[PDB]
Enzyme design. Structure first.
Site, mmCIF file in Angstrom:
data_model
loop_
_atom_site.group_PDB
_atom_site.id
_atom_site.type_symbol
_atom_site.label_atom_id
_atom_site.label_comp_id
_atom_site.label_asym_id
_atom_site.label_seq_id
_atom_site.Cartn_x
_atom_site.Cartn_y
_atom_site.Cartn_z
ATOM 1 N N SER A 40 0.797 -1.224 0.000
ATOM 2 C CA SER A 40 0.000 0.000 0.000
ATOM 3 C C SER A 40 0.830 1.275 0.000
ATOM 4 C CB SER A 40 -0.968 0.044 1.182
ATOM 5 O OG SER A 40 -2.060 -0.828 0.969
ATOM 6 N N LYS A 43 0.287 4.101 -2.543
ATOM 7 C CA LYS A 43 -0.892 4.965 -2.523
ATOM 8 C C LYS A 43 -0.538 6.403 -2.167
ATOM 9 C CE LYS A 43 -3.778 0.990 -1.511
ATOM 10 N NZ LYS A 43 -4.130 0.041 -0.416
ATOM 11 N N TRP A 75 -11.037 -4.244 2.143
ATOM 12 C CA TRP A 75 -10.314 -3.142 2.785
ATOM 13 C C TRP A 75 -10.447 -1.837 1.998
ATOM 14 C CZ3 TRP A 75 -7.124 -7.622 1.906
ATOM 15 C CH2 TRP A 75 -7.096 -8.525 2.984
ATOM 16 N N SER A 100 -5.595 3.809 3.285
ATOM 17 C CA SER A 100 -5.128 2.760 2.378
ATOM 18 C C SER A 100 -6.277 2.147 1.582
ATOM 19 C CB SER A 100 -4.327 1.667 3.102
ATOM 20 O OG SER A 100 -3.043 2.120 3.479
ATOM 21 N N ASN A 102 -8.573 0.547 -0.844
ATOM 22 C CA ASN A 102 -8.166 -0.159 -2.059
ATOM 23 C C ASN A 102 -8.998 0.234 -3.268
ATOM 24 O OD1 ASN A 102 -5.901 -1.755 -1.397
ATOM 25 N ND2 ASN A 102 -7.229 -3.148 -0.234
ATOM 26 N N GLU A 138 -4.066 -7.608 -6.661
ATOM 27 C CA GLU A 138 -3.019 -8.457 -7.232
ATOM 28 C C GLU A 138 -1.612 -7.932 -6.956
ATOM 29 O OE1 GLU A 138 -5.767 -7.683 -9.036
ATOM 30 O OE2 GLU A 138 -6.711 -9.638 -9.373
ATOM 31 N N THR A 205 2.199 3.679 5.158
ATOM 32 C CA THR A 205 2.626 2.313 5.416
ATOM 33 C C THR A 205 2.196 1.386 4.283
ATOM 34 O OG1 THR A 205 0.586 1.856 6.631
ATOM 35 C CG2 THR A 205 2.487 2.612 7.908
ATOM 36 N N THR A 207 1.567 -3.109 3.898
ATOM 37 C CA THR A 207 1.593 -4.387 4.618
ATOM 38 C C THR A 207 1.072 -5.484 3.686
ATOM 39 O OG1 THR A 207 1.047 -3.122 6.612
ATOM 40 C CG2 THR A 207 1.066 -5.532 6.786
#
Ligand code: NA
Ligand code: NA
Length: 260
Positions: A40, A43, A75, A100, A102, A138, A205, A207
């Site tokens: 992420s 972004k 998310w 974050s 999506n 992906e 961040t 993850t």
């Protein structure tokens, strides 16, 4: 290398670190030119690319996007929350950085011409390492040896410096980007746990989780002193390896401590 090398033995994977003090020019570097998955963390750069585009396409940020439920992704807490009403490009950008989100990231990628469009923006500011190739989710596969959706700690730090402190964005866009990075509604630790409590922090961040892959980059402002820019990226050799926020914080501490 020695303190970072010991830390990566305790982690059980690879750690990449780059930090620059914009006052003195001092740097700290460990595996800083190796590739790590972005997760992420792309972004943040996505939002910067949208802000840059607004300078040449006035009206972009206020454009309402009336997306459907199929645009939604696991998310996507903000875009799901506003599914029935839609969101503007600016609101999607805030959601992608601060939460974050999506679906917001995929919708904004569409506006820029896809992963290739974001990569082209990064090239336009001088970053020849960053590559985004795929969409959410992906892009998080983090397979060892796969260079798709990766960058290096040095390239991340240099690009973040240009966008938050340099002249890659006009000052109003730059301030918006910084303000989005300073928002911490998800309450992330990592670099934020490494800095003194009185320093301002703008961070993003990542993850991926798989292959113990996680990261963080930040611009940090010591009160009254020149800002520092840094990036900490991790990966691990086994699919089941757990990422470590504590390792990211520990590496960030060493980076700040290693600056002159
Ligand atoms: Na050093
Ligand atoms: Na301060």
């Amino acid at each position: 290398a020695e303190p970072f090398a010991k830390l990566e033995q305790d982690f059980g994977g690879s750690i990449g670190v780059y930090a620059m003090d914009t006052g003195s020019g001092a740097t700290v570097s460990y595996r800083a030119e190796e590739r790590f998955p972005l997760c992420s963390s792309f972004k943040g750069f996505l939002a910067a690319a949208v802000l840059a585009r607004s300078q040449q396409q006035a009206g972009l940020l206020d454009t309402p996007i009336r997306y459907g439920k199929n645009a939604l992704v696991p998310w996507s807490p903000i875009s799901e929350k506003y599914l029935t009403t839609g969101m503007t490009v600016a609101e999607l950008s805030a959601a992608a950085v601060q939460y974050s989100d999506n679906a917001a990231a995929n919708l904004l990628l569409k506006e820029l011409g896809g992963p290739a469009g974001l990569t082209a923006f990064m090239r336009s500011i001088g970053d020849t390492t960053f590559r985004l190739d795929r969409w959410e989710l992906e892009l998080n596969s983090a397979i060892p040896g796969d260079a798709r959706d990766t960058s290096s700690p040095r390239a991340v730090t240099e690009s973040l410096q240009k966008l938050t402190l340099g002249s890659a964005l006009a000052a109003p866009q730059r301030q918006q980007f910084v303000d989005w990075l300073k928002g911490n509604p998800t309450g992330n630790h990592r670099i934020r746990a490494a800095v003194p409590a009185d320093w301002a922090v703008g961070d993003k961040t990542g993850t991926c989780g798989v292959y113990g892959t996680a990261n963080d980059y930040a611009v940090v402002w010591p009160t009254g002193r020149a800002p520092i820019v840094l990036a900490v990226y991790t990966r691990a050799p086994n699919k089941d390896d757990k990422h470590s926020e504590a390792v990211i914080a520990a590496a960030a501490r060493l980076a700040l401590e290693g600056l002159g």
